[PDB]
From TrEMBL:
Residues 5-300 form the Malonyl-CoA:ACP transacylase (MAT) domain. The gene is fabD. GO terms for molecular function: [acyl-carrier-protein] S-malonyltransferase activity. The active site is at 88, 197. It comes from Streptococcus pneumoniae (strain ATCC BAA-255 / R6). One of its GO terms (biological process) is fatty acid biosynthetic process. This is Malonyl CoA-acyl carrier protein transacylase. It catalyses: holo-[ACP] + malonyl-CoA = malonyl-[ACP] + CoA. Its EC number is 2.3.1.39. Belongs to the fabD family. GO terms for cellular component: cytosol.
Length: 305
């Protein structure tokens, strides 16, 4: 019946979760637990350090702790998910919600993940273009022809009409030239992060694989649809899949199709932000959808209960 969709990097904002934090002990406990694991006050970072909040190595545990706290709050109000998924970093939040990853383990692990991603691909390096309203085949082909010139592949399959390509500057420029020729009307350059979810991140993925080998995963208490394979993840595959996730495409709409086939009717995006909700509305405007990131959005959800 219901899937929780967890936020990814880029949706953070100063003060996120603070309303919940003061009001709900399950929230304060979750954030202060992450603060202990980290060796610094995450609540103060989120509330006051805007530049650090936007630095990958802090963004990742900030969002994960905030999201896990929001999911845990939803659990206290009587919402339990039947399936989960999360956007990139949000996959780890979903791993925590799905019972497979310990919360304190997650917090340390994403601080490391963030670090490795940031060093291997800084926020201003390479290029990312959102290619709107063009067939997937065209985008893939364009990126293929352009690959002779360097790394360029689709990074984020968001909707059938919204695919972000990423990689190195010259190679990505050659890709959009091929797209315009092919007739692509709407190509939006993005200044969000390094070219994540391409082979450029292979060095990152090596370090993460060593770190992951140390992480001990548990049984899934609920099914999780993974970013990489757009399929329900199996316990024995988690680390191999998280290893590839940082250097391979995130396949969001295909994942939403697996959940609709599993018969899920209702979607709740766990904040910060409403990015996944925007995507699922395009995938299927008839799908029942809600997001929770703050007191107002919590009430809008609960008043249907």
């Amino acid at each position: 019946k219901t899937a929780f969709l967890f936020a990814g990097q880029g949706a953070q904002y100063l003060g996120m979760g603070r309303d919940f934090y003061d009001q709900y002990p399950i929230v304060k406990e979750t954030i202060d637990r992450a603060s202990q694991v980290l060796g610094y006050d995450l609540r103060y970072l989120i509330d006051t350090e805007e530049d650090k909040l936007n630095q990958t190595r802090y963004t990742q545990p900030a969002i994960l702790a905030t999201s896990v706290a929001i999911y845990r709050l939803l659990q206290e109000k009587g919402y339990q998910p039947d399936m989960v998924a999360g956007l990139s970093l949000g996959e780890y939040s979903a791993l925590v919600a799905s019972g497979a990853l310990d919360f304190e383990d997650a917090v340390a692990l994403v601080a490391k993940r963030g670090a490795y991603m940031e060093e291997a691909a800084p926020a201003d390096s390479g290029k990312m273009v959102a290619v709107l309203n063009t067939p997937v085949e065209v985008i893939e082909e364009a990126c293929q022809k352009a690959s002779e010139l360097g790394v360029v592949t689709p990074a984020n399959y968001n909707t059938p009409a919204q695919i972000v390509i990423a990689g190195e500057v010259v190679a990505v420029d050659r890709a959009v030239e091929l797209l315009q020729e092919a007739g692509a009307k709407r190509l939006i350059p993005l200044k969000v992060s390094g070219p994540f979810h391409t082979s450029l991140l292979e060095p990152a993925s090596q370090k993460l694989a060593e770190t992951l080998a140390q992480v001990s995963f548990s049984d899934f208490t609920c099914p999780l649809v993974g970013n990489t394979e757009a399929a329900v993840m199996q316990k024995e595959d988690i680390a191999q899949l998280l290893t590839r996730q940082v250097k391979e495409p995130v396949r969001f709409y295909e994942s939403i199709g697996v959940m609709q086939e599993a018969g899920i009717s209702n979607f709740i995006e766990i904040g910060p932000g409403k990015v996944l909700s925007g995507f699922v509305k395009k995938i299927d405007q008839t799908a029942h959808l809600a997001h929770v990131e703050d007191q107002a959005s919590l009430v809008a959800l609960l008043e249907k209960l």
